[PDB]
Structure formats: C-alpha cells, structure tokens
C-alpha cells in the first residue's frame, strides 16, 4: 500500500492537470491550433474542441477522469469555452503548489478560491451592459457565428448559415418563456449537394418518393397523413408463399387491386391530409400506380421518422387502416417539396406554424468531412444564444474581461486583506494565463500582449477594448466585435473553481493498491 501524502498527492494532481491545461492553451480562439486524435479503432480525428477530445481521449488519472464530466457541464450549457476552464483551473493548481511550496496550506487557499470566484462574478455584473434588443442582437450573433464559421471549418464564412442559426432559436424561444430547449431544436446535416446549401426546417424532412416522371409529381395542401397503416402495401422484411390458380386470375388481380388502391385513397382523402406517408416500404411498382391514381406516397420511411413528424405537427399517428380520424393525422403549417441537394432527388418539407417541437436547421455539404466540423461550429453557436434569449447579458471576453477581473481580484486581495489574499493572488495571476494563451497559440508575443490592455485598464475600466486574435492590429472587443455571453463567462468561473474544490474533497490519498487500479 502506497500513500502519496499532501504534496505527494498534489504532484499526481499536477501532472495530469499540467498535461491537459497545456493542450488547451494551444487551442484557444480562432488562432487555436487543432487537436489531433487517433481513435481506439485507430482512426484519424482532427478537432479544436476540448469537449470532443476529453470525451475521446482515454483518461487515465483522477484529474483526467474528472475532466469528462466537468467539460460535460460546460458544453451542454454554454458550448464554447471548453479550453478556458482547463487552462484557468490548472493555473490556479500549479500556483497552489507554489503556495504550498511557500508553505501556504492547501485548505486555506481552497477556502479562498471560492471567495475569489465570488468577487470575479461580482465584477462581471459591472462589466459589459446587459441590454440587447431582439432585432438588433441577432447581428452581433451574426458576427459571433461569423467568427466560429469563418476561421475554422470554412475560410470565408457561409453567410446563409450564421443568419439561419439565429432564426431557428426565436422559433422556439417565444413558445418557451424566452428560452430554447436543445431537444426542440436539432442541427441536421446531410451532404450530397453543395456546401453552400443551408435551410431552416420548422418540422422535419423526408426524402419524397416518385417512381416515374411520367407519373405526376405532386405536392399539395398543408396537411400530412402521418400514417403507419397501409396506404400502399407495406414490407416488414419477410416472405409468404405465392400461388395463383390461373394466369387470367392474375390478370383480374391487377384489376382487383386497382380498386383496392382507390379504396385506400377514398378513405384517407375524405379525412384530409393528402400527403400520405407510411412507415414500412414497398417497391416502385404499385408506387407509381398510386402516383397515377392521384395521391403521392412516401415509402421506406425510417422508424423514428414518423414520431418526429408527429410532434412537429403536434398531432398523432394513425395506427390502423380501420381506425381513421384527423386527430391522428398531421397538423401542418406548410407542406412543400424542395429538391434534396442539387442533383440527386427531392425532399418533402413539412413546416408547421403550430408546434415548434422540432425546429431543424438543415445544411448540406459537398464533403462528408467538413459537415460535422461545420455542425460542431453550429453546435456551440446554438448553445451561446440560449444564454442571450433568457437574459441579454453579454461579455466582451477574449482578453478584456480577463485582465479586468485580474485587476479586481488582486484588488480584492487588498480590499479584503486576510488569509485568502494569496488564494486571490493565485486566482488573479491565473486569469492572466488566458489572454496570454490567446496570444500564445497566436503568432504574437503573449508577453507583449498582456502589457497593452493592462495599460488600457489604467486608461479605461470595464473594457470593450481588449486584444485581437485576427492579427489586424486593431485591439478592441466592440470594433473587433469579439463579444460573448456574460452568463457563459460566469459559468466558466463556477466550473474552474469547482474542479479545484473537487480535488480537495477528502484527505484520503491512501490506496490498497487499488484506488486508480
């Protein structure tokens, strides 16, 4: 049994935290250098996001095993900022050794780290005023998602993507007390056409089936027949036996089923909802027969695809051919067909003005590799806007608010002068590691970088004037337009001091040979 007491604990707490904070600080900002991953299947993966990699990296230490759930809380709530919570909390951690090497007890600083987190959150209430009206604040989010798109997945900013993405959120926020749920929206991506192609779907999409162009390709009234019952013969993936008595019996059988095709028409059409969609599929033989018989039908529909159209319409599904009513049919706002991609086929877009229970941004790609990289830029852009739609609290982060609270917490070590002053000092110098790290991965000297806006804090307090990372030489945050949500930065304060609190929680560092084994 080996026990690693105190410092010997913290040396194990250094080395994994030293490793994970150093790999994040090469990845802050649009100058962030990308993270490469070989999978456990031996598969090349290149991201720049920590919450991807911390989920993908096989964690092998108590510090490292923590970071999966710690970065789970940030990305699910805030999105971007996976790197900054790791860089900050490790920088308190390595400084806490220096305090423990100074002889300062690890408990009294962990007491003071929480109070140092309080005065920083106190400062963010003064920083970066929190009133941004609904029509106007789309445009800085149009600028913010320009930053996420225009430097990482696509060099020159798909304009149609960042403007649709701010519009999908107002579709759900108004129905949901100025808040969006992330299961009422979905970032839907299907390659096949052009990478410039990007659409907003108020419901879901299914690939519309037509078997012949000689048979009429229809689209009609805003009501969908969400069916599982057969409007066309279905296929539950098996086989009967085929037997007919005569060939002329099969000649009459084609005339018999043609009346049976019209009976499936005259039952559905008298209830409404002329766009028929059935779950189990069929070949194209009786498909274009029903197209000739003047109602379109969609075949080979996925299993859960009938559910997502049901909640998007808000109505139910028709279970059986004998149970027939309109409440079990779809309640749609618009059913129109738009071509899937540019070259292959068409969809049937079922929009609703009734229920925003599945509002899906629908993008296309000319490359399979780029789209999940595009969606990952879109995953975090749809999470930061959830912060704004509740409260319009914003922050000018990226180097302005980092040096600003580092003034304040270091001042609060002097205003509140007691034992936690080195804990506040370990908090304040660690705040300077972040805009260093935005210039460290950049080509700029980060040592010069911390100097400039520090003089600006002598010039002006509560800065909308922090560093750039586009190397334009124009260091702002309101004319460089690097602006984030105040809720998101405040969440990063809570998460970083959580981890240092978490590794301090028992005094037990003994093992039976098995505490990490």
């Amino acid at each position: 049994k080996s026990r690693l007491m105190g410092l010997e604990a913290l040396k194990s707490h250094i080395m994994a935290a030293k490793a994970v904070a150093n790999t994040m600080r090469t990845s802050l900002g649009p100058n962030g250098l990308d993270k490469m991953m070989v999978d456990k299947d031996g598969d090349v993966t290149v991201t720049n996001d920590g919450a991807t990699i911390l989920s993908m990296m096989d964690v092998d230490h108590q510090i490292a095993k923590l970071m999966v759930e710690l970065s789970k809380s940030q990305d699910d709530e805030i999105g971007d900022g996976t790197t900054g919570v790791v860089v900050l909390a490790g920088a308190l951690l390595e400084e806490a050794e220096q305090l423990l090497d100074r002889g300062i007890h690890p408990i009294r600083i962990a007491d003071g780290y929480e109070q140092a987190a309080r005065v920083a959150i106190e400062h963010l209430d003064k920083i970066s005023d929190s009133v941004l009206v609904d029509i106007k604040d789309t445009e800085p989010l149009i600028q913010t998602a320009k930053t996420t798109l225009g430097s990482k997945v696509v060099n020159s900013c798909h304009r149609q993507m960042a403007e649709i993405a701010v519009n999908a959120v107002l579709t759900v926020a108004d129905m949901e007390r100025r808040d969006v749920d992330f299961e009422l929206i979905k970032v839907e991506g299907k390659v096949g056409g052009r990478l410039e192609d990007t659409k907003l779907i108020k419901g879901v999409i299914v690939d519309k089936d037509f078997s012949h162009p000689q048979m009429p390709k229809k689209v009609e009234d805003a009501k969908i027949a969400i069916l599982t019952c057969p409007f066309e013969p279905p296929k539950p993936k098996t086989k009967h036996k085929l037997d007919v008595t005569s060939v002329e019996d099969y000649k009459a059988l084609q005339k018999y089923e043609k009346e049976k095709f019209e009976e499936m028409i005259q039952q559905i059409k008298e209830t409404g909802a002329n766009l028929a969609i059935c779950q189990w599929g069929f070949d194209d033989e009786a498909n274009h027969l029903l197209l000739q018989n003047n109602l379109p039908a969609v075949r080979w529909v996925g299993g859960p695809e009938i559910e997502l159209i049901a909640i998007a319409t808000g109505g139910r599904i028709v279970p059986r051919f004998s149970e027939l009513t309109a409440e079990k049919l779809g309640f749609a706002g618009l059913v129109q067909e738009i071509s899937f991609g540019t070259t292959k086929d068409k969809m049937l877009v079922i929009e609703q003005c009734k229920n925003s229970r599945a509002v899906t941004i629908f993008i296309r790609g000319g490359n399979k590799m780029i789209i999940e990289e595009a969606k990952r830029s879109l995953h975090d852009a749809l999470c930061v806007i959830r912060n704004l739609i509740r409260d319009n609290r914003v922050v000018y982060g990226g180097g302005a608010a980092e040096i600003s609270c580092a003034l304040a917490v270091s001042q609060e070590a002097d205003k509140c002068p007691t034992l936690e002053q080195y804990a506040m000092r370990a908090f304040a110098d660690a705040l300077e590691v972040i805009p260093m790290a935005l210039s460290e991965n950049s080509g700029m000297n980060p040592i010069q970088t911390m100097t400039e806006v520090r003089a600006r804090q002598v010039k002006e307090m509560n800065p909308a004037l922090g560093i750039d990372c586009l190397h334009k030489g124009t260091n702002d945050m309101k004319q460089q337009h690097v602006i984030e949500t105040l809720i998101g930065k405040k969440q990063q304060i809570s998460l970083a001091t959580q981890m240092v609190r978490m590794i301090l929680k028992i005094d037990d560092i003994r093992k039976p040979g098995e505490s990490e084994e």
């Binding site: 220096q98 002889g103 270091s410 002068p417 034992l419 040592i447 100097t451």
Partner: protein, 508 residues
C-alpha cells in the same frame, strides 16, 4: 545558443540559495545558532550567519558572491548582515519562475534595478525623519535599536558614550556617512565597563622611554622611518670577530653616525616619536635611543606599519622618512601627551588632543579580562554602526519585518498600474519581499503563513497597526512596543542583493 549557459544559471541559482537556506534558521534575534563543522573537523556554535559565511563556505562562484554580499553589508552597515542573505535567495525564487516562463535575464535584471529604485522611494515615505544634530534625539533613536538587538546588557551605558563620540564629528546637519577611519578602538586590560570612556586624539600602547619624559605639554608628534644600524646578511654586526680591536674600531663608528641623526630630531622640535617594529626594519639602536631619551623626548616603539598609516591621516602627522622630512606639517602637534598607568591594569599612553583634521575620536575599552573586554567591543561597535547608519540615511523606519510587508503590498499594486512585460518581474520582486519576514515569523513561532497575511491586513487598512514583535514573540505593533532600526540597514540589505541578482542573471 545560450542553452549551455542556461543550465549553468539554474545551477548557480539553486546553489546560492542552498547555502543561504541555513541562514533562514539563523534569521533574527530569535534566530538559530548554527554549529559549524570545520574542514579539519571541530564544532563551532555560531550565530550571525555572515560570520558563518566568512568561516565555513563552499567554493562556488554563486556562493563566493554570497560572502561578498554580507561583507559589503559588514562594511557599509555592519547590521542587517543576516537579512542581506535572506533577501538574495528570496529573489532567486522569483528568477526561477520567470526563466521557466521564458523571460530574458537582461529583462529580469533591468526590471529589478527599476523596482529597487522604486521600492526604496516608497519605503522612504514609510520612514519618519529624525534629527542628526540633536544629540538627545540621536540617543533615543540608537538605544531602541540597541535594545531591539541581542546585546543590550552593556549597550545601555555604552550608547551615550557612542552618541557623544559621533556628535564631535557631526559638524553639519547633513552629517556624512561615517569614517570609522578616525575611530580607534583601544583595549585596556584592566578597568571596568563603567570606566570605559572617550579619549580624544589617539591612545597609544606601551611606551619605551630610556630617560625620556612622561608628561610633556604641547608635544610634537614625530615619526621615524630610518634604520640606525649596519647591513645584515647573516649578522646584524657583520664581523668575523675573534678580536677585540676589530670589534672596537668598527662599532664605535656605528655610534658616530647615530649621534648626529638623533641631534637633528630634537633641534627640529620633537616630543613624541612614532617608532614601528624592529622587524619592520632591520634594527633600531637603543643606545642612540638612550641618548635620544636623554634629550628629553617621550618615545613609543614597536607599532604596526599600517597602523602608523592610520595615525598619519588621523592626527595630521604626515609621514617622516628621513632627517629632511623634519618639518612643521609632517609633525603633529599635541596639546598634552602623557601615559595613564592607573585606573585599571596595564598602562596606555594618552595623546590628549592633537592638531588634527576633522575630529580624531578614540574609545578606551576596559574590562576585567580579555573576554569581558571583547563583550564591550561588540557593544561599542554595534552602537557605533546604528548611529552611523542613521546619519547616512536621515529618516528612521520602524523595524521588525513589517515594512517589507508594507512595501510588497505597494509594489504589487504599482506594477499593475504601471505597465509591463516586466510587470510580472516586479510582482515577483514583491513576492520575494515577504519571504524574509515570513522566515522571521518562523523564528518567532506563531505560524508565519497565518502571520504574514495579517500584517498586510493592517498594512492595507491602517497602513500599519500590527507588526512582528520578538519581544511579544509574534503579533504586536512595532509602533506599540517600539522596535526600530536605521533606514540604511534595511536599504543597504536591499540594494546589494539586487545588484548581486542582476549580475548572476547576466552571468553565463
């Protein structure tokens, strides 16, 4: 590339602290006695770790700067010599963080030289101005530091004796640094610490008078730098002697020329004569000295060569090497020269005043035996230095480790408000400042980490309302119970380490 001198630097930074880390225990009046193992092997109970550096050290160039660091603190102040060790190893902790950060040592050098000039400016505002021409203000200022130090058992009666001694050479109010090169310490073998006093001019040892005078009024201080004998290869009297005539004819002629040189001494006017050792020459003829002392001149003999060079510059007895240098300016002019044989064992000649530039001040140390005499020697010289360091730096600062906690509180704040790529260096410079009173607040006991953050609880709000008081053994204001120091012993301990640090940063 500087990568091979890079590894040399971190080795030098590590090695300089490792010898200096033993002085962390020896820091303060509650500091630890450090028992020295000699190079041949013997125990030596030792405090005042500057003396430890002079006694036992390792041969390392960073370590050889350390013995130079305290020696400069010995000669400029003589006090703060333990604290001048601790500040330099504290700064090296700041150096390791920034070199690991990747900051050039040229940058770290010039940042510390700026912050040194900047720190003593704010430290001066912390200090309070005291008088240097008021003799009484000098008395209260000195003994409070003397009671703050370890020895005050004899420093009580010996404080005002030193105060009257320096007051004679305090002619202006500016009151320059102090020459100890007119201050002569003289031991008297008997007598008492109560009987120690200040005798003006210089006080001489054993006189050698064959027929010479004992008390001469308005004496003429003379110097002899010439021999009275024959050349010497094997014999002082180079004869192959086996005969009475050959020893008679050549040795009466040796008497002849020393007859004529002796007469030239008294005719030019001499009453006190300075004669060095006869090993500093080849021989001195006592028969000519008997004829000289028969010409009524009081004579001392056998004194050191460099000690005469102290005497020549103090009382204006400019060097006489021959008969031709018998003048009025080469010879000093005493008002009264006599020897005191009583008031204690032994006997010491008293040149009671002389025609001297400035004021030649001499103390007579007495005591029962040599160890009792050596007790007063530390007692006078420490009392001499605390006056010396206050006339160098006019203002007074309350001592006790608190102004470092004060100054680090401002230098962290100003380095933020100034600017800097080197702003980290000054903020690491100030982080080195509170290491030394923390290591002092280990020797006081009463946990230093809990201690040091609660002084700048008082240095932030009330700017000082608590201090480290070794009288209390901990948290008590150095203004409440008075623990003071001169301004120089803090500054000179500060500035010499900074100059040492910027050197070894630039040292490959």
């Amino acid at each position: 590339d500087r990568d091979k001198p890079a590894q040399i630097r971190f080795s030098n930074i590590s090695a300089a602290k490792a010898v200096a880390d033993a002085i962390r225990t020896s820091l303060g009046p509650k500091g630890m006695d450090k028992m020295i193992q000699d190079g041949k092997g013997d125990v030596t109970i030792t405090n005042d770790g500057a003396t430890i550096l002079k006694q036992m050290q390792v041969l390392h160039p960073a370590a050889r700067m350390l013995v130079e660091l305290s020696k400069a603190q010995d000669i400029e102040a003589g006090d703060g010599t333990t604290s001048v060790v601790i500040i330099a190893g504290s700064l090296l902790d700041s150096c390791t963080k920034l070199l690991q950060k990747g900051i050039h040592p040229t940058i770290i050098s010039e940042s510390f030289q700026k912050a040194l000039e900047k720190g003593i400016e704010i430290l001066t505002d912390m200090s309070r101005p005291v008088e240097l021409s008021d003799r009484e203000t000098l008395l209260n200022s000195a003994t409070t530091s003397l009671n703050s130090k370890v020895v005050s058992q004899y420093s009580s009666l010996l404080s005002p004796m030193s105060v009257n001694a320096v007051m004679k050479v305090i002619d202006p109010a500016t009151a320059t640094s102090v020459d100890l090169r007119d201050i002569k310490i003289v031991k008297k073998l008997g007598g008492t610490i109560d009987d120690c006093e200040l005798v003006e001019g210089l006080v001489l040892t054993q006189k050698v008078s064959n027929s010479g005078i004992t008390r001469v009024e308005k004496a003429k201080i003379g110097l002899i730098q010439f021999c009275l004998s024959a050349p010497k290869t094997d014999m002082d009297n180079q004869i192959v002697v086996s005969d009475y005539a050959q020893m008679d004819r050549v040795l009466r002629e040796e008497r002849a020329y020393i007859l004529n040189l002796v007469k030239q001494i008294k005719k030019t006017g001499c009453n006190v004569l300075l004669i060095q050792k006869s090993i500093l020459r080849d021989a001195l003829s006592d028969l000519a000295l008997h004829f000289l002392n028969k010409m009524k001149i009081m004579v001392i003999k056998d004194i050191e060569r460099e000690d005469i060079e102290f005497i020549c510059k103090t009382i204006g007895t400019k060097p006489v090497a021959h008969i031709d240098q018998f003048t009025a300016d080469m010879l000093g002019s005493a008002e009264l020269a006599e020897e005191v044989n009583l008031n204690g064992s032994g006997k010491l000649l008293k040149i009671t005043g002389c025609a001297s530039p400035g004021k030649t001040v001499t103390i007579v140390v007495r005591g029962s035996n040599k160890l009792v005499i050596e007790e007063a020697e530390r007692s006078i010289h420490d009392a001499l230095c605390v006056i010396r360091c206050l006339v160098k730096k006019r203002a007074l600062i309350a001592g006790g480790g608190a102004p470092e906690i004060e100054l680090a509180l401002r230098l962290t704040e100003y380095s933020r408000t100034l600017s800097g790529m080197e702003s980290y260096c000054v903020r690491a410079f100030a982080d080195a400042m509170e290491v030394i009173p923390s290591t002092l607040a280990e020797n006081a006991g009463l946990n230093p980490i809990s201690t040091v953050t609660e002084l700048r609880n008082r240095h932030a709000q009330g700017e000082k309302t608590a201090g480290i008081n070794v009288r209390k053994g901990g948290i008590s204001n150095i203004l409440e119970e008075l623990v003071v120091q001169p301004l120089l012993v803090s500054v000179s301990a500060l500035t010499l380490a900074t100059e040492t640090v910027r050197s070894i940063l630039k040292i490959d």
